[PDB]
């Protein structure tokens, strides 16, 4: 995989993805 | 919290949410 | 496509997906 | 609102958010 950037103009919507990102990233840390 | 239903008409989009759902639910199972 | 159900146990997380669902569904209504 | 960046390490997950981003951004273009 590579490094991708998701620039979102706003604030609330950015938080929404931030949540789906906290869980997904949590799966990689799962152990 | 209560039980909510997200009926999505399609197939690919439903999978997208299915992923964000696999991680979030994984956080509740984390331990 | 068919009809799928996304049952999420909680309330805030359900809203998150609800937003991504309002826009996607908005694309289908776009015209 | 301001400009936020969502750097996700991977490729498929980045696409998932890319979809929820295509619709949300589509709502701002709706008119």
Experimental technique, in short, is NMR
Q: How far apart are CA A8 and CA D24, in angstroms?
A: 10
Q: Chain B within 8 Å of D18 (Cβ-Cβ)?
A: no
Q: How far apart are CA D1 and CA B15, in angstroms?
A: 30
- D6:A13 CB<8 A: no
Give the DSSP letter string of chain C. Answer: -EEE---EEESHHHHHHHHHHHHHHHHHH--
Mark the breaks in chain A: residue after which each occurs, C to N over 2.5 Å.
none
Q: How far apart are CA D19 and CA C24, in angstroms?
A: 8
Cβ neighbours of residue C30 closer than 8 Å, sequence gap 6 or more: D26, D30
Nearest-Cα distance to chain C for D23, in Å, is 5
Q: How far apart are CA A25 and CA A11, in angstroms?
A: 20
Nearest-Cα distance to chain D for B31, in Å, is 23
């Amino acid at each position: 995989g590579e490094y991708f950037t998701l620039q979102i103009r706003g604030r609330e919507r950015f938080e929404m993805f931030r949540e789906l990102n906290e869980a997904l990233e949590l799966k990689d840390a799962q152990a």
